[PDB]
Structure formats: structure tokens, C-alpha cells
Amino acid sequence: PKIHYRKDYKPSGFIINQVTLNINIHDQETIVRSVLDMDISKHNVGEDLVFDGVGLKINEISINNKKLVEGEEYTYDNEFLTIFSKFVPKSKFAFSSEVIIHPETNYALTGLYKSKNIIVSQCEATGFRRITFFIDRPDMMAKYDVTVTADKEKYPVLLSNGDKVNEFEIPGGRHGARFNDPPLKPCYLFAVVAGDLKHLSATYITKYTKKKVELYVFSEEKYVSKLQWALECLKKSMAFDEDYFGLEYDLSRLNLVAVSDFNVGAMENKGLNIFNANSLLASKKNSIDFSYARILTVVGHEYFHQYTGNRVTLRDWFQLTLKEGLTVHRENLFSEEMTKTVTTRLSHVDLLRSVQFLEDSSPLSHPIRPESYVSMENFYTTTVYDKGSEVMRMYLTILGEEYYKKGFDIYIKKNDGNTATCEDFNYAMEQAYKMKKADNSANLNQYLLWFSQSGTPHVSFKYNYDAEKKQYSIHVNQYTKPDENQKEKKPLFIPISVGLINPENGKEMISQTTLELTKESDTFVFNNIAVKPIPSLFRGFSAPVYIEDQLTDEERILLLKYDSDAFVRYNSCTNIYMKQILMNYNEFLKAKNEKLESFQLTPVNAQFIDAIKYLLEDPHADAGFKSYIVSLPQDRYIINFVSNLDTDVLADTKEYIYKQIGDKLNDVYYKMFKSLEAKADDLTYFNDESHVDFDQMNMRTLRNTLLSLLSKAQYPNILNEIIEHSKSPYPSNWLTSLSVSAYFDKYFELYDKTYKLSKDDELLLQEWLKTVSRSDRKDIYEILKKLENEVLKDSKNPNDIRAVYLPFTNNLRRFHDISGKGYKLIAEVITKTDKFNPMVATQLCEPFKLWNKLDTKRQELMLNEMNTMLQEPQISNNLKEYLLRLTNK
């Protein structure tokens, strides 16, 4: 396999100035004619002209309207079209081709493909070469003039980038549309859509230029009633970029299109953003609450790419985090402002420290700007996205909002209309840094290590207080464990947002303060500190690190009750739980290993339980935050702290801790579940899709979290509550009733009831599938077999396959059955899926990412299945590369 190296970047010996496409969609094939107006670049050295072109059937190819002859003048090997240099002109020339492609059978969903009755493209990263010949890399910027033709009855709506400049009838029931997009773009931002699409539209007027922008949101006819919230989100996105960043949309029209079959969330094709339907479509009757934040997030994300990715684009794919980390950061600023709830930031952190920290301590660990790749499809990772976002967010923490905005505008103004690199962004931030510090000798050279160094830093603390001197010190150390990318890890520039809490009254003792740790260790001293404080460390989770706060549980409780920062409160709770989990895990582990007839477990701290009760009973406290404090840390977060983790022993540990807390607080939980009903389930706005109340949804999250705790506990007569909950109009509630009924003999009654409610909406049925998949059932393998036979069958829809299998893989007790049967099942699904969709097959490998963190028996069982998958003769490039890296081969 060809390995591409970051350091090998060099401009092409060629230029493509103009692309003129004719895409003619027929019943059994699609014919693509393309003329490329090309030139020779200053870097040219008389090389062969080599085009990317994957899976293309050549009808003909020409240069300057002279037909080329295979073998003598060109070779094609289904991957590269090579035109021998003696036949390549030395000045401006036209290359033309006609190829045949087959979207109907393109089940990998890259290139041009059919999703139900919609023809749609996905070209990022290197999928344009599956549509026609190109030098398929993002620094090859060109103008596009695109004509699409199709059967008019099947495909009445035709879309591509740019302005629709002509529409015309064609003999035999066909029609065409021509789209001219004069601004330069990379080919991965090309898109085309054809289908019997229905829409909602609106006009947006920009803040400063007062330009009218037409907004269209499209779906298949069946789901046109689910388009409203997306349109609202798009308006919100435009306003936020205007309001925070001063950035307006530059084009006449923006189209959003939902398709049922999509490998990921959505795609920012210029003026023509294409979405997984689960990330664009919702209605209150047919969607769970999570859809509303999801659509807001994903519409926002694709919109913010119009500047960070589309107007300022990438020199090469090693710069991916420059557009993705930066656009996730913009998306997070947006969603935090729109939701006005602290759980938005907490949910980002929760994801990072479970999923991304697991990746960063796995054999897959990489920096946010890797040094090499083989598969571009495998390059899109939580490290590049979510650690990249945290690295982009640290610039805002370091500079503050005013100077951050100044630096961001410098980046935009300098690079608008051009490709760029991670260095360009750091440069812009550094200019702001000099301004802020009032020191042109200040620099951010050290900051670049965040782009190149892999692994999660560990930051630890020691404290000292002198009562007589009123002097407080915070001693800080950082460490990154060596890994396969760096033998020696350098100290990073780590911004530590801190407060000092007076333990007597809970008040702030210092102003807003961001410690800049730039060495392996440093001591920060504060004078005129009148009493020994409790430190509030890494407020807002100010760096993507393992925090070792070295606080007592008494101190952590005080922060949990009285600190001003939501993350530090949440983290202090997390840290109390982790200390308890590690202690009880070891106690259970020793009892298992030593085959003990009796033994003791350390109980949960009673003052901690009292603090949970205190917060729960506070009517002015936030419902979303409450739902976090009664939930143990994610299993994936816990596994970062345990070697040779015995999943059975962890399951027993969690069970003990939940039971300890429930035995004290269940009556509190029940009282809250009942008192929250009126506000949580208020139907006043149920038939208004413009009205979304994130606090109300958090009240339902709390009610559903409590109901789960009470059902597991077999709280007296709680089945009454479950049955009534199943009658709620909100899918979040009635799907919750299914999962919590797992503990009762009414489970299959609710299975049938909720199936009947779900089966006639494609996306709701996928949510029902997830609910079943994640049900805490002893007979879950039998249930999965029933889903396969009765509902999933041989669907190639990634949303169906992911819904049936991924939630189950998070079942700690059952997926990790010591027989290895869960590992066997998912590997069979991976191999089956790999035949038609390698990218999604590689997603389905997710539960194996922690294989070498488990107990020795489960390590062996997982490794056996990965080696079995690797031995499949027909294994894809994606899956082979991924599993070879994951298994350290």
C-alpha cells in the first residue's frame, strides 16, 4: 500500500483551470463527460500526466480533441490514468473524457451513488476520482461548469454547486440543468443531487451587506414535515457567524439536502450541504430529544465550514484538523450560545475523555496532524476532530475573547480564497498573542507541539499554604507517556484556568486567572490569600489533559456544592466516583483471584451521597447537571485508569456503587421523578417545530435517568410509572419506557407497542433499534437474532446496521461475555459489511479499540477475532490497514 508522508508535499506539475462536466443519469448507468482546461505549472519537469480515476469505464479520452490510443499513449489500471509525457502538451491544453459509472450499485456511498430514489455524491476526501478523472487533491483549485441530465419523472429536482443558469427539456422524457460556479474550489467540494425532492425555504438578509440569501432544505416527499427545525438552525447559524465573528454568507443560495444512506453526519459541499437524514430531519412526534441538539450541531458545523474549509481551504490532507478542529470549535461556541445550558460543554468533555482519550492511549494513537496516511477514509478520527477542537479552543482561552476574535479575523482576511496550513493559523494567533502581551518578542512556537505530539498529557498538583504569610502556591507538573510516535515527549504550552474558592463562604478569592504552564513543572504563587483555599482547576476543561487534582474527597465535595464552574463541579464528582470505583474494583478483583469465601467492600462516602441529595433537592439547580451527578463515569473513561480490566469485575463494581447510592436516595429520586413531570412533559408547544426548549429536554433527561435508576432498583410499584410513561407523546419517554422495562415481565409487551409506534418512520425505527440493542436483557443475543431476522435483514443502510449493533457493544456484561461470543458476532458483522462498505465496516470495529486494555483472556479472544478478520481474502484496504495498526502488526 502507498504511504503518503506529510514532509513530501510538493505542488503539482499541472494546473486545472476549468472543469466542464456533463453528467447523464440513465437507468442502468451514468455517463460522465468532462473537459479539463489545463496548463503546465512552474514545477513541471516533463513528467507523465497522471490522473486519479477509480473504477471508471473508459469510453474515450482525448487531448485537444484528438482521441488517445490505449497502450501506445496511455495506460489505465482502474486507479491511475497515465498519459505518457511525449503526448502531453507543453502549453495550455484541453483534456477530455467520457466514462461510465454505476451509482445504483455503489453501496460504499463514496463518489456518485444512489440512496433510495435519490442520486447523490460524496467526494471528500478522494471520492471525486470515482466520478471522473482528476488530479484529486485539494490544492488543485478550478472553476466548475456542470450540466446534469436525467429522467424528469424520476428526478425532477437537479442540483449542483453555483448558480442554476439553464433548465431545458430533452427528448424521451428527460431534462437537464446547468450550474455555473465561477469561484475556484477544490474538487472534494463538488456535489450533485438528483431526485423527487420536496422542500421548505426562506430568505435570509445578511447583517451588513444586506444581501438576500435563499435558503432551501430538501428531503424525500414522505418526510417533508420534518424539515422545519433544520431551517431554523440554519438561520441561527448564519446569525451567529455574523454576530460573533462578523462573517456573512457570500452566495445567493444555500441548499441543505437529507439522504437516507450516508457514511457519517454531513458534508459541507459549497452551497449544497448534504446530510445523513438523522442529522437534518426531526419532528416532535417522530424524533427523540437528542435529534434537536444533533441537527443544530450538524447544520451549524457545515455552515461554519463555508469560511473554515471552503473559503479558506487546505493545502493537503495532513492539514485536515485546520478545517475540522476549527469548525468543531466554531460549532461548539455556537451550540453553547444557542442552548444556554452548561451540559452542552460538559457533553463535549464527556465525549473527549471517554472516546478520544481511549483512542489516544490505543495502538491507533496519532497527533491531530499525523505524519503519514495510507487510507484517507481512515484519517477522519475523534483525535483530528475533537482533540483538534480542544486545541483550537485553547487559543481562545489563552487570548481571551477580544484578542481571539482579532487573531481569527487576521487568519480569515489573510487566507480567504486560498489554501492554508496549520502554521498559518498559529501565525495569526501569535500576532494576537504579541498584541495581548504587549511584546513582539512573545511567540507561540511551543504551541505547535499540540499539532505534532500524540498522547494525552497528565497534569498533577501539589499545594502549600502559609497562614502567617497569607501566601498560597500551586505546584504543577506535566507528563506525556512515550508512545510509538515520540520516544521523548516535550512539555506543552498548557493553559490552566483557575479559581481559588474560600471554603468558609464559597466565594471567589482571585480574579479570572489562566496559568500558562510552559515547562515540565512550575510553581504559581499567590499573595494576600487570607485563608487556605480549595483550588478550582482547569475551569471549563481548559486543556485536553488527564487532571490529577490531588484533592481530598471533602475538598471535592465542597467544590461540587459551591464552586462557580460547571466543569470543575462535574469533574470533582467524577473524581470522587473514580476513587470509589478503583477501590471497589480492586476489592472485587482480589476476592475473585483469591477465591474468597467472604470479604469487605469500602462503602460509598456518606458525605458524598449527602451532597448529591443536597444538589438534587435544590430547586434552583440545573436538571441537566443533576443527571450527570447521579450517573457513574462512562465505562470508556474508567478503562483509561485500569490495567488488564476485567469487565465482569467492573460490572460488579458499578452495580455495588449504584445500589449503595440508591439504597440511600431512591425515595428522593422517586419524589423528583414525579414532581418533574409537569414541566418536563409540557405539551404546550408539541405542534410547534420552531420552539425548542433545551432546559425542558434536560428535565426529561433527568426524569429518564431517574426512572432507569429506580427500575434497576425494583423500586416498589415502579412498573406502574413505566407503563404510564409508555403512553407519553414524547419518543424520548416512550422509548425510555421500553429500555427500563427490561427489568420486568412487560418488556416484550412494550417491545411490540413501541415497535408499532416506530415502524412507519425510517429514523424513528432506527431509534427503536438502538433502544432494543441497548436494553439490559439477559436474552439480548436472542433479541439481536430476532432483530436480524425480522427487521434488519440484509439492509445496506449504515444507519440500520449501526443502530442494531453499536449500542449492544456497550453492554459491559454481555458484549464481553467470556465465551467471546459477542466479539465473534461483531466481527462477523464487520466482515459482512466490509464487502460493500469498508468505511462503515471500520466504524463497526470501534469496540475492539480497547482490546489490549482488558484482562488477558478477553485480550486473547478479541485478538483472535481481529486476526480472523485480517485473514479474509477479500478484506478491504480500509479494514486491513486499520486492523494491522490496531493489532500492532
Ligand SMILES: O=C(CC1CCCCC1)N[C@@H](C(=O)NO)c1ccc(-c2cc(F)c(F)c(F)c2)cc1
Ligand atoms: O461526520 C463527521 C464527524 C466525524 C466522522 C468520522 C469520525 C470523526 C468524527 N464529520 C463530517 C464533517 O466534518 N462534516 O463537515 C465528515 C467526516 C467524514 C467525511 C468523509 C466521508 C466519506 F464518505 C469519505 F470517504 C471520507 F473519506 C470522509 C465527510 C464528512
Ligand SMILES: [Mg+2]
Ligand atoms: Mg466502475
Ligand SMILES: [Mg+2]
Ligand atoms: Mg442578526
Ligand SMILES: [Mg+2]
Ligand atoms: Mg430503509
Ligand SMILES: [Mg+2]
Ligand atoms: Mg503499533
Ligand SMILES: [Zn+2]
Ligand atoms: Zn466538518
